[PDB]
Write an enzyme that holds these catalytic residues in place. Structure first.
Site: not given
Ligand code: IBA
Ligand code: IBA
Ligand code: IBA
Ligand code: IBA
Lengths: 389, 389, 389, 389
Positions: D72, D332
């Site tokens: 990330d 998400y």
């Protein structure tokens, strides 16, 4: 911005080849482009711009998702659009919403987008106004709720859309949604010959009526014709009486015996047909398009008829020209109108499908013919695409 | 928006290399681009933006549709355009209409697009105003009706366009359409030397006259010169008297005996030639471009002449510079004018065709030279494209 | 629109990593993109949009025109641009004009574009205002007339541009063009240390002075510093006295003996250096950038100095952070300012060249650091590009 | 332009499938497209346009930079965006700034962009207002300062953003930045259950409160719920009492014993969860989304609850439909609101990650469901992407 209203057509007495949008002239394995795999194209125009809408299978050519691109309904399909004149590639297009059946129109201030999706026995019409999802409508016959596949028509902020629900091989009674700013303010139930009406191509015959040449898939090769009253909000349907049957497949012209209302042999099947108006102070021109081949979606012919009553006129329509020859594809056709400075230009679009079976991509080209000048229709349209590349 | 009118040229006494648009510097089999295969490019400018128009064969490089891209007329060709400065790729361009011959101009409020198409013996000029198809014009000599391949010229909302009809090897009497808001309000029949006039490059010599340097394909290497009166709406044509013949092929300069009106040997053939005006309060500058090679479309030279009468002036034009050398292609050239804040900048564009025969793609680059500053013309333009890649 | 004027800088006391534009992270032989091969990038901002300009070799990666992309001047080069934030691909960019040296600035109403091109011994500065070619300037020393390679600076509609002419190994006396609406209304001849001044990075120190940190290629590793008076229109040049030499190559800091005006050893060569102002009511912050390596264009450091006189201050500048480490390329750097609602944000851009020799493509990435918040400079920039792909 | 304020939601009682943005349906090695490799997508809307934001690894498919696209944080990551409806390709997108964590919102006049980047132990929140970098905020716990990964919320020009700092396996006390025109005018310290709060999805419950359903990564499968007072500028946090735990992984519903404030077993880990409001004059609808699988990010369910207090209501939420089945990815989810003419449409977006391990690309699709019409949620979303192509 002020509301759109139908105006008098611009003057002319003939249609000419206007524009061809052949996205797949750029889909070679050798080329470097990404035209989307589409079907059911239609054009709708606002006061300032026209738009080329279509139902994409969310796939491009060249690509690796050709499997299933010949079937019509699924969870990947989307209503997309480009400015008319632009090639519908992966980057050029705007994805409006998920839909395996659609429609769209401009009310003078904003775009309304209709997309139907969901399970066959419980599909759903979803309405989007500009960027906002504003409303939805449910399946009433619980058999693939579907819509026009062509432009809806707005007048004074009120837009009318034809939806239908039912079996393709049996009864499908259509309805008409009166939409305003994205929300259904009314549901119109038509009267008359209601047993089967789908893929209606509608337009304004005047400021009082909206007429649609539609498709009967189960009982006849004659097109159901709708006369919708915008003041009383009532519709009534019945077959076009003309000798010149506009559905496909169909028998020889004049072949069907009996009065205007006779179905004749079922001739199982049909096709969405082009239809647009030419409004003059004195007369009304009704333009129709129909495949050249009686049994196959090959070729496209242009027909006209001034005045009369489509319901009671048995006379033949007048051949106005070959837009597409028998060796080229002639699938769905629709009508739309470009808004010029003072008057409206009627046009007919032809979906030219590239069919090579279920084991290869399945997409379409869109040919445009519009009323312009006089004399006779001069040239035809070829897609120019070789499916082997 | 208020109507466009020709204004005084911006000051300057020389042309310099402005911009090169070489779309095919990106057409390698290795690259990832899609420049369109085009020909007959021209630039037209509105008050705010200039546009690079062209006639595409509806194909790209790399691609698989090079066959036939060297021939000029067919059912696939389209008039396309991009903002000047943009590369004309599949996604960048806007397809205006089907046309194998075109023209375009901005009247100060909207774009007018001219595209001619249809069968050779019955072609048709179609007019589009912005988004609307507004009018058409028919073949009168019934032998490939064609137009300018360069910008039309508007004044006060009235746009003049040269069209011609006839044999390339014989007589082609040209006409002039007076167009207003998309519809032909008048047809001007020129007087004088009318036997052959095609691909006229026109511009405003003042607010009263439009002059065109045109092409005679059958009888001479001298360019027919048109003087059109915008107040009386009458045209008259006759040969440029100058020693410096601007057509290709052509004989040695001064080679043709006799008075100004002598044709000399036919010198079968020709080419569209660049021509633009430089309006000063006191003087008129007439800029011409012509190939460097007398027999082939290789190279491009710049010539100027202040005042005089093109019809009666036998004097040589003044060499003003080599825009393209003999080793680079020099095909069609045209004039156009960029609108600066208070004055107009005259420019000449050169179509640089990539010819490698009928068995490979055939497209073009566009070089731009504009009046700017003073001194002498400083550098030439190369396309930089290798056709083998 | 009203004219642009320099305003107070927005408050802050540090620069942070803002944006990286690495076009070649998409140039793989495997990818499907067309980033242009460029060099000499710079950013210029109008009141509403910033633009990423550059000098393209009219070629892309992947492509087949890498040969010659390491050399700087030729007939194919063009000044191009994209909105800052956009990747400079073949389709994204706008080609402004042919130039192998450039500059650009926004006067508050329109864009001015400077491109120099032509033969080395007679090059030419060409000016474009928006769409119109408005003026040109000639070679005075007849040895590659060149310009800034960074933004010009406008105040009240008057834009100042540094040009220079001469040998890279000898004397190059620079000049300053005062441009207004595209036409040179004045030519400023600087006073002082005029023997060599090139690739000046200029900005507004106030509403009265424009200061440039420039490049001396023949005589010193100290940067010539220009103080230009916008009211009297006079310039004067002399070396930055600081111990912290900003050119490359250069000797150890403080290495040069003598007074401020001592050249020291020639240290043949140089580089364009970043320089931007931080205007406060009370103080002036001068931000400088310089390569980390003393001899090679690897890495980039940030330096600041508040007040003082660059001409007489021998003190070291304050290290403010490593924008690029020694293992990453650090070539040209420039300054520019984003216009926020009430104040101006100073930024420094770094050209990160991908050098792999003359036998492969040669292009650049552009890293951006801007004044924002406080504390210390937190992270560095890597291009992330593997030249083998 | 005038400031944005939350208005009443448009009427409806159900969510339907709105739009799917599957960029990788065009990433085949065979295709000719360049969809960006992204993660953490979210949608934010201004009064006129919605935008699809995301964190790109500065790489495309097909491409050669898949290594590391599953991690990330790094120096290549950037916050990018496209108009909602557009496919996020290399050319379609706009790169806003370098960020490995972001957020964005429209205050009614301009766009505010939040991007956090820098070294883990000293990261930095950077704020951009339109084109200008306006402010920054520092790490307080010195352990990866991060933000929402979903839209911030503005009211009257004041925008609130949740940031957090700390260990993923321990304590992370979140804070709230009150931003105005790009500069932090206030830092809010929440009260209550502050031990761990990350990736808060916030919205307006009214004009007085902003509520966030957030993520606790260390101590519970219950989502910390924030009640922020926009008038007193104070926040207070505590666990949603509901039986229907919304984090992943989580135990059986109702599984956790004790009072509302009991953590239960840590259930190490979590996920950002969808949450959006439905404001009526009389009632408040709170919509939540959570994975179908209790232990894996597969599937996505829709839940609703009208009124009550999330902090004290132990009751189960009402299942409102399967947006994504257990065989499709469900990562998400976030909330956002489209601004219709008079009212606001609440929507939930689902990030559908294409995971195939660390040894291949790692990107995401984004599914959209919005409140529209009534009845029950009708269809689910599939990405349709085959990772092998
Ligand atoms: C006569 C209607 C039939 C059967 C229901 N639908 C149908 C037929 C054809 C065709 O090629 O004839 C294309 C698409 C559809 N369509 C569908 O299958 C769903 C709606 C849509 C249009 N009717 C568009 O995809
Ligand atoms: C002298 C006119 C001739 C013969 C009719 N036409 C012609 C010639 C050339 C050329 O290379 O010289 C290119 C295009 C055309 N064109 C055509 O063949 C149709 C119109 C158009 C321009 N005249 C453009 O395609
Ligand atoms: C010190 C000036 C030198 C020699 C004249 N020019 C020069 C040097 C470099 C470099 O890498 O240092 C790049 C480009 C140029 N340039 C040229 O060769 C022409 C102008 C331009 C900038 N000075 C831009 O291409
Ligand atoms: C619970 C927070 C964790 C650990 C710090 N961060 C985190 C987790 C995941 C995930 O797949 O669960 C994706 C991205 C991040 N992110 C990071 O690693 C940095 C910020 C960002 C979002 N929290 C976005 O990249």
């Amino acid at each position: 911005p002020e509301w759109t209203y139908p105006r008098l057509s611009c003057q002319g007495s003939t249609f000419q080849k206007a524009l061809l949008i052949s996205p797949h002239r750029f889909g070679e394995i050798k080329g470097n482009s990404a035209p989307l795999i589409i079907r059911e194209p239609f054009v709708a125009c606002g006061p300032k711009e026209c738009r080329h809408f279509a139902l994409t299978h969310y796939a491009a050519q060249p690509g690796g998702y050709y499997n299933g691109t010949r079937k019509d309904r699924n969870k990947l399909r989307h209503l997309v659009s480009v400015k008319l004149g632009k090639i519908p590639t992966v980057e050029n297009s705007i994805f409006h919403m998920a839909a395996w059946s659609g429609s769209a129109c401009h009310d003078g201030r904003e775009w309304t987008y209709i997309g139907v999706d969901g399970p066959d026995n419980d599909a759903l019409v979803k309405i989007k106004y500009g960027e906002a999802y504003t409303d939805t409508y449910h399946s009433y016959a619980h058999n693939i709720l579907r819509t026009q596949e062509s432009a809806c028509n707005c007048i004074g902020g009120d837009c009318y859309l034809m939806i239908t629900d039912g079996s393709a091989s049996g009864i499908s009674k259509c309805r008409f949604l009166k939409i305003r700013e994205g929300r259904i303010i009314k549901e119109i139930l038509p009267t008359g010959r209601v047993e089967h009406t789908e893929e209606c191509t509608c337009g304004f015959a005047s400021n009082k009526t909206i007429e649609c040449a539609c498709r009967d898939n189960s009982y006849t090769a004659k097109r159901p014709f709708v006369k919708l009253n915008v003041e009383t909000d009532t519709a009534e349907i019945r077959l076009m009486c003309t000798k010149t049957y506009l559905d496909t497949p169909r028998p020889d012209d004049g072949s069907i015996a009996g009065p205007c209302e006779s179905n004749g042999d079922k001739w199982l099947g049909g096709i969405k047909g082009g239809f647009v108006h030419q409004r003059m102070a004195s007369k009304i021109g009704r333009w129709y398009s129909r495949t050249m081949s009686k049994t196959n979606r090959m070729g496209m012919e242009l027909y006209v008829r001034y005045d009369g009553d489509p319901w009671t006129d048995s006379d033949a329509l007048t051949l106005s020209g070959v837009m597409v020859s028998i060796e080229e594809p002639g699938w769905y056709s629709f009508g739309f109108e470009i808004k010029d400075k003072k008057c409206d230009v009627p046009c007919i679009g032809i979906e030219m499908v590239h069919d090579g079976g279920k084991d290869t991509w399945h997409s379409a080209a869109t040919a445009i013919y519009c009323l312009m000048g006089s004399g006779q229709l001069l040239w035809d349209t070829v897609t120019g695409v070789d499916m082997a590349l």
